């Protein structure tokens, strides 16, 4: 403080003062209610409010938003992946169709036609012209006895061996090689005591064991 | 009024005009040109320096992480329904395993055991009630060789109508209801040496058309 300039004392000391001997009030808490002065009405223009602004709280988070999309997208991925076109031509009868053709159904029809000609060979008279008429004139035979009965009978057997090839390459079947037994005695009683066809007929079902057992046989698969 | 005599020089005016700029070109390098710094002498302190900082580092990069979580997690959710291993799913004839037990394979064996009893009934002694009526055989043997009757043959047909119910319970595609014709003439030629027995045998394959035609809901038509 300079006396030559007459500096003036600011009001900073009155604010920093700690003691106080000027207040002459009998009470500042009980009298505050007498005038109806409560903090409730002051809390409206004095109490703080609620301020909260977040960008992730309102805006959608692309991070978690991706996990919510794959939820149904992935669940439907393998679901629709199982269905490609919407049709099953195999019908559980020719799975080889996917890697072949599936003649099992079609060829099944041509077989019913030729399978009958075997016994109907006598009902169908030969009317087509033959080219062996001049070859018989050289031998000239007069004794032409009838001898047709076992030739077409045994023919029904080889007719199945030649068909085992087109079917052998069908695909991979593992039905039942152990069941081949229950099917054996099944034909034994079907035969009679006199002529037993099961003796030579067994060789026909036995060959089926190879085509079916084909499920696993690298020993003869080169 | 004449300050051109050489009065004192006031400094208040020196502050008004105290700006200068020897360099007027746009390039400010002319200021350092006065030093003549060389690149070689400066390359000596060219050790550490020349670098940058990543901006995405401060930002989180786990956004796509939430998408990869449900990516494979949900992809397997539906896969568990079908099965990852898949042991004997169809095997070519096990499609009923999902809507049945698969008696077509096993039950097929019990049929070979009873299907033979039909003809074997003559090879073994019957157990019909009434041993007195057989007094003719107990008194003496008279003609007891092989003999196929028709009263026992018709029983082979009544056994196929009672077994179709256990199989019809499953129901399957008609496969080829149009092929039923190509199979008819195939049996007509199978016999041609007198009275064709296929005449009555047709009723047997005819019932098969109903089991296979089952492919469509019977209520849709009736």
């Amino acid at each position: 403080m300079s006396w030559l300039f007459g500096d003036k004392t600011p009001t900073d000391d009155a604010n920093a003062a700690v003691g106080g001997q000027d207040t002459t009030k009998p009470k500042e808490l009980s009298l505050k209610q007498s005038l109806g002065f409560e903090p409730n009405i002051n809390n409206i223009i004095s109490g703080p409010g609620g301020m909260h602004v977040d960008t992730a709280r309102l805006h959608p988070l692309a991070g978690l938003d991706k996990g919510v999309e794959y939820l149904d997208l992935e669940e439907e991925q393998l679901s629709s992946l199982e269905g490609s076109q919407g049709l099953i031509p195999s019908r559980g009868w020719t799975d080889d169709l996917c890697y072949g053709t599936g003649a099992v159904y079609l060829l099944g029809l041509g077989i019913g036609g030729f399978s009958g000609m075997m016994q109907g060979l006598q009902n169908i008279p030969p009317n087509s012209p033959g080219k062996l008429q001049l070859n018989t004139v050289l031998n000239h035979i007069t004794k032409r006895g009838p001898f047709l009965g076992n030739n077409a009978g045994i023919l029904a057997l080889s007719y199945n061996i030649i068909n085992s090839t087109i079917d052998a390459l069908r695909g991979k079947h593992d039905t039942a090689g152990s069941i081949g037994a229950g099917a054996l005695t099944g034909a034994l009683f079907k035969s009679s005591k006199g002529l037993k066809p099961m003796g030579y007929s067994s060789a026909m079902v036995a060959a089926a064991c190879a085509v079916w057992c084909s499920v696993k046989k690298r020993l003869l698969e080169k | 009024m004449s300050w051109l005599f050489g009065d004192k020089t006031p400094t208040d005016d020196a502050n008004a005009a105290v700006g200068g700029q020897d360099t007027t070109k746009p390039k400010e390098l002319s200021l350092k040109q006065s030093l003549g710094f060389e690149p070689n002498i400066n390359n000596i302190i060219s050790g550490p320096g020349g670098m940058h900082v990543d901006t995405a580092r401060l930002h989180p990069l786990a956004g796509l992480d939430k998408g990869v979580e449900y990516l494979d997690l949900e992809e397997e959710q539906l896969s568990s329904l079908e099965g990852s291993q898949g042991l004997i799913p169809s095997r070519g004839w096990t499609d009923d395993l999902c809507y049945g037990t698969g008696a077509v394979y096993l039950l097929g064996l019990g049929i070979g055991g009873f299907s033979g009893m039909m003809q074997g009934l003559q090879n073994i002694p019957p157990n019909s009630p009434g041993k007195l009526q057989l007094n003719t055989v107990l008194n003496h043997i008279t003609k007891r060789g092989p003999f196929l009757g028709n009263n026992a043959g018709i029983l082979a047909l009544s056994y196929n109508i009672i077994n179709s119910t256990i199989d019809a319970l499953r129901g399957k595609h008609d496969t080829a209801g149009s092929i039923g014709a190509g199979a008819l003439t195939g049996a007509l030629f199978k016999s041609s040496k007198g009275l064709k027995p296929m005449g009555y045998s047709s009723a047997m394959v005819a019932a098969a058309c109903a089991v296979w035609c089952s492919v469509k809901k019977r209520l849709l038509e009736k």
Binding site: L64, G67, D72, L73, E76, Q77, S79, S80, L81, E82, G83, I88, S90, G92 | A62, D65, K66, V68, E69, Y70, L71, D72, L73, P89, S90, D95, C98
Partner: peptide, 25 residues
């Protein structure tokens, strides 16, 4: 064969993409 779904929600297939795991929700 047993392979027939029921009712499909539009079409949105997707080839195999990514193959790792970190968090779980």
């Amino acid at each position: 064969m047993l392979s027939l779904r029921q009712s499909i929600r539009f079409f949105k297939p997707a080839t195999r993409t990514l193959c790792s795991s970190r968090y779980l929700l």
